RNA sequence: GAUCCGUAACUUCGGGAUAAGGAUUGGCUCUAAGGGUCGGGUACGAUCAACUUAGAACUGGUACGGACAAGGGGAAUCUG
RNA sequence: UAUCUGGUUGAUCCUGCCAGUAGUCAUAUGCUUGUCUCAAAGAUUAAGCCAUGCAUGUCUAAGUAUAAGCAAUUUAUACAGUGAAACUGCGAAUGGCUCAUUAAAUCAGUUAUCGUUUAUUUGAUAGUUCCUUUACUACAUGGUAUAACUGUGGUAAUUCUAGAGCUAAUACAUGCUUAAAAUCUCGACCCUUUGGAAGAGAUGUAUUUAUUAGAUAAAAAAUCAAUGUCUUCGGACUCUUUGAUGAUUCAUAAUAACUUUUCGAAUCGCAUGGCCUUGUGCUGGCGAUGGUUCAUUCAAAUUUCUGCCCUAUCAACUUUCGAUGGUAGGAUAGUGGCCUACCAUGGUUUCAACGGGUAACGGGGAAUAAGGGUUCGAUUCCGGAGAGGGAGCCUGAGAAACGGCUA
């Protein structure tokens, strides 16, 4: 099968390694996930020690964490927008770690209007004292607010979907968002 | 080295799980994490005031210095962030009752906290396998110029 | 080789077992247990080669299946059970209690203890940690996890363990001026009371130790076991008390006891 | 003599890698798969035996297909497989509705009934009682030992302010 | 034909050599690299205009220098 | 246990080899061979080929017993003794053999895992499971679907098996019950203040992500964003809690959620005792198996330093289609060019790289006895590798297994 040893792979002097022992089970490698978007499919791969890995492929919902607000919402994934390794995974919408995606911006919007009530972009008793106590927690950003107008937030994946069966991430904010915006603008 | 313009790669270069909050208006504009490497090796001021990332740094990265602590003299600073040092020693041939000079070339990883050139003595420490051949990491530079600035022009 | 090994051959067995060179191709491989290979003792080796109660390994199992020998209170009917250092071996028949403690020549001794000393053992705390839900626990040298210890118990200390309850009743810290049993190395089985602990950050601290003839020697920490204060120990000591007279003093000791 | 396999296709023989829990193969090792000859499922001229199951009996009786009823060899064994077998409405003391087979020791007739499995007895209730007891007693003992550990921490926190107060 | 690989004896060291011998080649949709001019007191951005090369996906009755055009090659002997 | 002798000349003294001499845990062979103890042995060459037989199976009071098996007696009309078969669990990855490959590889001594998986053993370890929380859901205990078996068959042939009819589980798939609180979120209302309030939900563990805590270098203050205990309503806030390492983004905790939702006992044998509301009511001992997490043991996989025979009639090698390094991803049990994308041009070498040879597995060791050495090590132990040559894989904690499979 796939090996991941250095028993091949010429030494630092450039010498060709002579062929030692036949291919070992504990130096195994396997094929990539290549997770797509839509219609959740997850297979289980029996690893060493039992200890199953969850080879996701074609998954569609994720757990994305708005980091400066402290919350995490389960949202759709629309598509992959940027990938620092290969532009092909941007073209075919393959979700790996560190991909930059557009997620949903609807439950975060609903939470923000339940927590601050300010209608991004553009009654009863206890939430009145609440929304008094906030606000100075409701001046979020120019560049993250202006995505809520579009109904889609930029986000990064932080889970490895081929190993965990999850596509979890966070929401881009600050200088990371400015960096990926400078990437996304100056290629279009 | 790292050639500032630090965000030079296709990914955003950041330290993992180090959050600096956009709401809370901090007038240092970036949080940094740095550690003590152990064994009395002083973390340099270029690791705290520096703005590189370098996830294989012994002080601002995810590696730990444990195992052998070797020293060597630098013979190649041409690779990016990794140098090659020479390590010379004597091998006792027991028949002839005397020694022969031997050497070994070791490639070690050098953080951008230090500036190393050819000739400088470095102290390196064993860390986890960094690359195919790199297993060591620079923890001390024992030379600065090897009398380079003391060779200017005439009167 | 494809998996774990199950056979330990003769001449690959530990030498302090004193298994005979000829007369057997194999040696009892100690089971997985509290102790290791090279610092334990199978119960077959104890009941046959030391105590000579059994003539075979068949009779050792014939003994062990009548629930007679019990190690550290629990019954332990495994033929090659790895009984190790500080273990209390209770034979309810013959009313005997043994403590596996080291000879000065480095061997496991047949050391009978009285029936009140058989109700505790000593454990050098190998690691103290925080378990799940924030519960601290000590791990002794025989694998016992003991929850909620005293917070003054740090690493390399010793701990008295009550052997009916798994709990702790007392502990001795590691300090300059406290008795030591040496368990491993060239000085295995020696005894006594400390000079000074060399730190050596980066690995392998050293301890300097001075017995009661003022013969100072140096060992690592991993061989050092604390067994009480100077003079007063917490356990019964074996015969000889861990002194290591040299070969001249030994032959002069034996040639004194020769008058029939 | 090669057996036919359901739904291979293809009325000739084929070599399939048969696996566990699959007809036309019994494995002599755990996880072992073996490549075997298997004829597919369409009837042709090479067949020496067909196997037919009478789903509907016709107007005229066969020899020993209709006229003889071979009995069932065993009767039901689990408690609910006997309660299902008689329609019992579970109070009905299934110990009495067991099927007993009588066998002859020559001139003395013994009889054996199987075993009721999954049948609630005092022993099963006692064991359930012990397990539910040990969970509660264990949880109580750990809560108490945590309480005494907090007492130990408290008497060291009143103690580690006292040596700051005498200096 | 073109592109990429691989090329022997011998040699007057220049050659032999397109040696010999192999692979690829369409269409479509993308990706990347290669530029011009303008304002900085004594780090970049606006804008404009090129066909060249490399790569990826898809696609078809495995076809693609689709007609046209366009070397057969080698081992030697005599001889100039 | 520091030894020499014969041979060049007519004779001499030398260099110098030939030959003698002694040993071989060093093989063969010839002649010979009475006794005791000890005992290598198809290594060399053919890791060439194999007839036949055997070498891996396994049951305790304690998983499954309606053998139409045996023993019949002694309290047993569910079973209750012994017990074939078969299911299930476990092992078969150990041992044994051989030395073909293999020259920084193996291996040896030494390190590391703050870079990982680990059945078993050993020690600890889980009151939370259902539901918009008065007409509720089996918990005195839930569902089929097979084996052996009987019956019908096929084939020249086999550890070949089809069809039909029954029936089990610690197999397979399911599914409940357990405190009282604390803390969070939200909140039916009024009452206007320095606001204060029922009650609705959540709250184990496991996975995955993000954030926070995880203090200590020795003494004093001021402001701003929210809101906290005691209120002699100016405001104080006095005592504030914290492990490990040389070293961490460690152990561990907290918050927001997430998950084709892991686990949280529908199991077994003996004992069968204590309570009164007499319900076949509630409780109750020893230990057997299994199970989550941690630690331990048995290991494993990588890994630091240093060390290999002959060869220059091998002086340049490596980047072909990764060669050296960086970033990101994939993969893995995990680090890592292990693999992929983008980028850089590095990396080794006269201190012998690279290539070649090895009639080369490495070591502990063996032979030889002045000292130094010289030769040997297929072979009783350790490590490695292989089962005709390659490759691929299932099962499992562990195999790239060959007394397993596939080509």
Swiss-Prot record, chain A:
Keyword hit for Phosphoprotein: yes
GO biological process, one term: maturation of SSU-rRNA from tricistronic rRNA transcript (SSU-rRNA, 5.8S rRNA, LSU-rRNA)
Gene3D superfamilies the record matches: 3.10.290.70, Ribosomal protein S8e, subdomain
Principal localisation: cytoplasm
Modified residues (Phosphoserine): 65, 68, 72, 85, 142-143, 146, 149
Keywords: Cytoplasm, Phosphoprotein, Ribonucleoprotein, Ribosomal protein
Cited CDD domains: Ribosomal_S8e_like
GO cellular component terms attached to this protein's record: 90S preribosome; cytosol; cytosolic small ribosomal subunit
PANTHER family (alphabetical): 40S RIBOSOMAL PROTEIN S8 (PTHR10394)
Similarity comment text for this entry: Belongs to the eukaryotic ribosomal protein eS8 family.
Misc remark: Present with 15900 molecules/cell in log phase SD medium. There are 2 genes for eS8 in yeast.
Function: Component of the ribosome, a large ribonucleoprotein complex responsible for the synthesis of proteins in the cell. The small ribosomal subunit (SSU) binds messenger RNAs (mRNAs) and translates the encoded message by selecting cognate aminoacyl-transfer RNA (tRNA) molecules. The large subunit (LSU) contains the ribosomal catalytic site termed the peptidyl transferase center (PTC), which catalyzes the formation of peptide bonds, thereby polymerizing the amino acids delivered by tRNAs into a polypeptide chain.
Listed name of the protein: Small ribosomal subunit protein eS8A
Species whose genome carries this gene: Saccharomyces cerevisiae (strain ATCC 204508 / S288c) (Baker's yeast)
From Swiss-Prot, chain B:
Location in the cell: Cytoplasm
Any one GO biological process: maturation of SSU-rRNA from tricistronic rRNA transcript (SSU-rRNA, 5.8S rRNA, LSU-rRNA)
Entries under CDD domains matching the protein: Ribosomal_uS17
GO CC field: 90S preribosome; cytosol; cytosolic small ribosomal subunit
NCBIfam families xref list: PRK08572.1, uS17_arch
Function: Component of the ribosome, a large ribonucleoprotein complex responsible for the synthesis of proteins in the cell. The small ribosomal subunit (SSU) binds messenger RNAs (mRNAs) and translates the encoded message by selecting cognate aminoacyl-transfer RNA (tRNA) molecules. The large subunit (LSU) contains the ribosomal catalytic site termed the peptidyl transferase center (PTC), which catalyzes the formation of peptide bonds, thereby polymerizing the amino acids delivered by tRNAs into a polypeptide chain.
Additional comment: There are 2 genes for uS17 in yeast.
GO-annotated molecular function: rRNA binding; structural constituent of ribosome
Cross-link annotation Glycyl lysine isopeptide (Lys-Gly) (interchain with G-Cter in ubiquitin), location: 14, 45, 55-56, 78, 95, 104, 132, 140, 147
Protein name: Small ribosomal subunit protein uS17A
Superkingdom classification of source: Eukaryota
Organism: Saccharomyces cerevisiae (strain ATCC 204508 / S288c) (Baker's yeast)
Main location: cytoplasm
Swiss-Prot record, chain C:
The UniProt record lists the keyword Translocase: no
Molecular functions per Gene Ontology: RNA binding; rRNA binding; structural constituent of ribosome
Domain of life, source organism: Eukaryota
CDD domains (UniProt xref): KOW_RPS4, S4
Domain S4 RNA-binding: residue ranges: 41-104
Sites bearing Phosphothreonine, chain numbering: 114
Cross-link (Glycyl lysine isopeptide (Lys-Gly) (interchain with G-Cter in ubiquitin)): 61, 133, 160, 167, 173, 178, 210, 232
UniProt keyword annotation of Phosphoprotein present: yes
InterPro entries from the UniProt entry: KOW, Rib_uL2_dom2, Ribosomal_eS4, Ribosomal_eS4_C, Ribosomal_eS4_central_region, Ribosomal_eS4_central_sf, Ribosomal_eS4_KOW, Ribosomal_eS4_N
Residues that bear Phosphoserine: 31, 246
Record's GO cellular component terms: 90S preribosome; cytoplasm; cytosol; cytosolic small ribosomal subunit
One of the GO BP terms on file: translation
Extra information: Present with 573 molecules/cell in log phase SD medium.
Oligomer status and interactors: Component of the small ribosomal subunit (SSU). Mature yeast ribosomes consist of a small (40S) and a large (60S) subunit. The 40S small subunit contains 1 molecule of ribosomal RNA (18S rRNA) and 33 different proteins (encoded by 57 genes). The large 60S subunit contains 3 rRNA molecules (25S, 5.8S and 5S rRNA) and 46 different proteins (encoded by 81 genes).
Protein name, per record: Small ribosomal subunit protein eS4A
Organism lineage string: Eukaryota, Fungi, Dikarya, Ascomycota, Saccharomycotina
From Swiss-Prot, chain D:
Annotated GO MF terms: structural constituent of ribosome
Phosphothreonine sites (modified residues): 104
Gene Ontology CC: 90S preribosome; cytosol; cytosolic small ribosomal subunit; nucleolus; nucleoplasm; small-subunit processome
Biological processes annotated in GO: maturation of SSU-rRNA from tricistronic rRNA transcript (SSU-rRNA, 5.8S rRNA, LSU-rRNA); translation
Source superkingdom: Eukaryota
Compartments it resides in: Cytoplasm; Nucleus, Nucleolus
Cross-link (Glycyl lysine isopeptide (Lys-Gly) (interchain with G-Cter in ubiquitin)): 57, 72, 90, 155
Annotated keywords: Cytoplasm, Isopeptide bond, Nucleus, Phosphoprotein, Ribonucleoprotein, Ribosomal protein, Ribosome biogenesis, rRNA processing, Ubl conjugation
Protein family per UniProt: Belongs to the eukaryotic ribosomal protein eS6 family.
Record's miscellaneous remark: Present with 66000 molecules/cell in log phase SD medium.
Its job: Component of the ribosome, a large ribonucleoprotein complex responsible for the synthesis of proteins in the cell. The small ribosomal subunit (SSU) binds messenger RNAs (mRNAs) and translates the encoded message by selecting cognate aminoacyl-transfer RNA (tRNA) molecules. The large subunit (LSU) contains the ribosomal catalytic site termed the peptidyl transferase center (PTC), which catalyzes the formation of peptide bonds, thereby polymerizing the amino acids delivered by tRNAs into a polypeptide chain.
Protein name, UniProt field: Small ribosomal subunit protein eS6A
